[PDB]
RNA sequence: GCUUUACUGCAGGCUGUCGCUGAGGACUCUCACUCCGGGAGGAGGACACCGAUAGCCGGGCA
RNA sequence: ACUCGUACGGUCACUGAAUCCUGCCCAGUGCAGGUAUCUGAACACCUCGUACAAGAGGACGAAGGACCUGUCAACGGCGGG
RNA sequence: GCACGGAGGCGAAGAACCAUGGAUUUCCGAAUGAGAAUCUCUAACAAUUGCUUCGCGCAAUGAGGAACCCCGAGAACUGAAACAUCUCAGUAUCGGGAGGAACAGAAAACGCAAUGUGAUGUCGUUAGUAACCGCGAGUGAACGCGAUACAGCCCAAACC
């Protein structure tokens, strides 16, 4: 047959790429030699095309102007601090170790100094639970317990823009506009609505999957479609 | 369209190659321009 | 480095090269790793020199143990061009051998003893 | 008595033992950071180089080349093929890694000609070889009775035509008797069956 | 052309083994190697990656 | 490539606004988890064989399978008496 | 000039014509200062190399050629009255490269087993033999011999 859509993706052609040239900034924590004396002022609050959430422009004492992952409750004029000695207030960045437990955090680093990887989408947050001279247990938004190096820097507060998911798109047109800002092919044609040659679920006099939808982890690309290595399906039980 | 100096030189040449075999040549050889390109019925390169 | 098992103090190295220079003018000297090797093998070696800035190291790796199973004394030298110049060459030399000193057997003998003591 | 050279050689019979072992464990670290073709002032194996024609002289050059280990990097068939020709994983090239290395070097020095090459070890994913090249245009070589032969026009791009030592063994030209029916005088004149 | 529990194979995935690969049936370490860090240095570590091979799955493809 | 992205994400599928709803079935097929015991290749190892070798056998046993379990908004099924 | 017109001209100062050698030889073109559909913009071996007075100072490479030659990559139709090994075939085609010819070549050979031959190509033969093969269809040498032409040498190391 022909390569399925999932396979056309990987080639990275225009249709599948994200409009990178239209993006603003790669939101990452700053690199401080050490000390914490690094502080800056919020200059403006801008919209981030890549995340559908706000982001804050900040000017640092050392003339550095950079956009930053804005937590909720950060306004123009506010003073933010990034370092080991950072104060413990919303918008400030400092290693998990210096952070008190029970405090919601966002934009958490997986490796000290990697700039932040976890908890960065609209209104999400991580929850620093345990400390130690070795491990810093954090609970990510998915609910998983992640052991982390306490030297990993993070930002206090929940990400801005919370609740974005509460409103329905209502119409195709709205989906369309959002989709246009992401690296994604949209709308979606069902496999069963295709021809045998185009998808493992294609063909037939009527529409229905040909075989069972749960597919093995070992299935090859071109065939791994439907419910990938599902441990269970349905709602029952 | 906008032509370059070179294109213009080539068009000029084609226009020239489009002239007739002079009268005297007919006499000098005791007796056709196989390159008669019409602007409408024919087509030039480029 | 891999064939170097002890460090020769700058001063010692200086005295050693000094001895070598007179050795060429009074007694006899062998310049070049191949010629040094045959000395150690033929026994006609009293003191052999080996540079430490030799690349590749294979060119000399053998000198130590060979000299040790032959009872011949050897000393290390940081530079390679200094050993070559001290031997009287306009070029460098990875190894040199004092084949019968000359008006320096006293120093050589001592330098040998100093190294032995230097372990 | 033994030449000093004999010692370099005797060491390289067991590159995984003794001082040479520790030496390699160190070098490769630097090598894995160098490029694909690095020119070097001195051969890592003097005895071998000299044995193969090397000479501390103007116009004689040496270079270490790195090449990946393993079978052919082959793309699977994109059209009909009988089962016999659908292979990918077990297919190996007919040119050995050493020749690949000799060619990568010669291309790097367009004006030079390959003289010979030898192995200098390998880690788990690549092999290194040192190639000896010659400047057929330098008078220091055009006047050398033991090398000026490589200056002749018909020696141009000799590595690409298999005229190298490794090139000739790989062409199955070692045996002068039985077994070399389809190799000598050339693979191509024998309809490519050797 | 297409399908599948048709025949035969071929990619791919999983898994064992050998090489890279080192010090003291469960374990510590650091020095290769990998990753984070501008760097100092951190994490990981003889595993992973990669090369070779073996068993299983394998209309994704011939 | 996704990705100047990080689960309020994005990938793979099914159904197809709203409203009232969505029963029974895990035997088969699929997927997933577990597994005393059984089965399970090659290297290394042991025995026999061979002044070596081919070869035969043994010990050990990974994934996988048997076996057990979970799962149908998973493929699908919902009869005769 | 082909090219046999009109006008006019050149040649005994030996023209035309032919041979060899030299002068001139625009732009693009490997195309090389940079850019470009044959043009343009502000001193140029661009790029990769060798030597090096370490300065592009001295040099090299690049591209072409009817096929031939050498080194790599490598099908399928077809034949087997289907078809998978096999066959078509190491063919077609593709990548890299040399020369006027390439390649090969002075035995770690042969093995008419010998008290024998004596670098290598090629031609004739050996022979559709030995050998391979769903032992099917098919595939398929060599030594030797008769010829052609003949040619044998240099390093590494020892010792200096
Ligand atoms: Cl969305
Ligand atoms: Cl060459
Ligand atoms: Cl004979
Ligand atoms: K066929
Ligand atoms: Mg980023
Ligand atoms: Mg939704
Ligand atoms: Mg788009
Ligand atoms: Mg749809
Ligand atoms: Mg349809
Ligand atoms: Mg299909
Ligand atoms: Mg339907
Ligand atoms: Mg349906
Ligand atoms: Mg006109
Ligand atoms: Mg020939
Ligand atoms: Mg990296
Ligand atoms: Mg098929
Ligand atoms: Mg130009
Ligand atoms: Mg047939
Ligand atoms: Mg038949
Ligand atoms: Mg054949
Ligand atoms: Mg024979
Ligand atoms: Mg000589
Ligand atoms: Na279908
Ligand atoms: Na026209
Ligand atoms: Na070359
Ligand atoms: Na063959
Ligand atoms: Na059709
Ligand atoms: Na069932
Ligand atoms: Na079931
Ligand atoms: Na001319
Ligand atoms: Na040039
Ligand atoms: Na220059
Ligand atoms: Na037929
Ligand atoms: Na048929
Ligand atoms: Na067959
Ligand atoms: Na006879």
Short mmCIF file of C-alpha atoms (C1' of nucleotides) and ligand atoms in Angstrom, two decimals, chain G residues 80-83 134 136-137, ligand 19:
data_model
loop_
_atom_site.label_atom_id
_atom_site.label_comp_id
_atom_site.label_asym_id
_atom_site.label_seq_id
_atom_site.Cartn_x
_atom_site.Cartn_y
_atom_site.Cartn_z
"C1'" A G 80 13.02 -23.44 -15.68
"C1'" A G 81 6.90 -24.37 -20.48
"C1'" A G 82 3.91 -22.31 -12.89
"C1'" C G 83 7.75 -20.85 -9.18
"C1'" G G 134 14.66 -28.15 -6.91
"C1'" G G 136 15.84 -30.19 -12.67
"C1'" A G 137 16.49 -26.73 -16.37
MG1 LIG H 19 10.75 -28.32 -13.47
#
